[PDB]
Assembly symmetry: D2
Homo-oligomer: 42 residues x 4
Amino acid sequence: KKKPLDGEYFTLQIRGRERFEMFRELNEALELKDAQAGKEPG
Amino acid sequence: KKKPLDGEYFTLQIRGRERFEMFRELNEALELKDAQAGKEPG
Amino acid sequence: KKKPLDGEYFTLQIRGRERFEMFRELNEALELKDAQAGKEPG
Amino acid sequence: KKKPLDGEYFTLQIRGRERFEMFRELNEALELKDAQAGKEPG
């Protein structure tokens, strides 16, 4: 549960708060799939 | 001319370099439309 | 059980097979969140 | 002139009208870059 090296770590400047929330949504979307990857297929 | 009065300015931490390049592409996509918004009609 | 009362149903023509696979990935991303929405809290 | 030799042609069923408008926006985004690809440099 959480330990050695995680994935790399970059950043991105998003101008405008409106579109900002839009990108954040896609961010959690991809990160969610990653959590389903190391999960037993069952 | 130009003026520092741009929209707000936020940021986002994108883990993984692979997924990073993916988000960056979408960023330039929306920003491109913004440049076409201030384009005088014809 | 299930019931055909799903949300609306539209479509989108994606030219290019390369870009096609890219959009399809985002589709499953949002749909995944929907499945977590009806997940009873705990 | 033009020629019907465009890229492949696939499709995608997007449930929900709300999320539909979201994907459509990304579609025009990538297509815009394609139009800038065949733009003679200067």
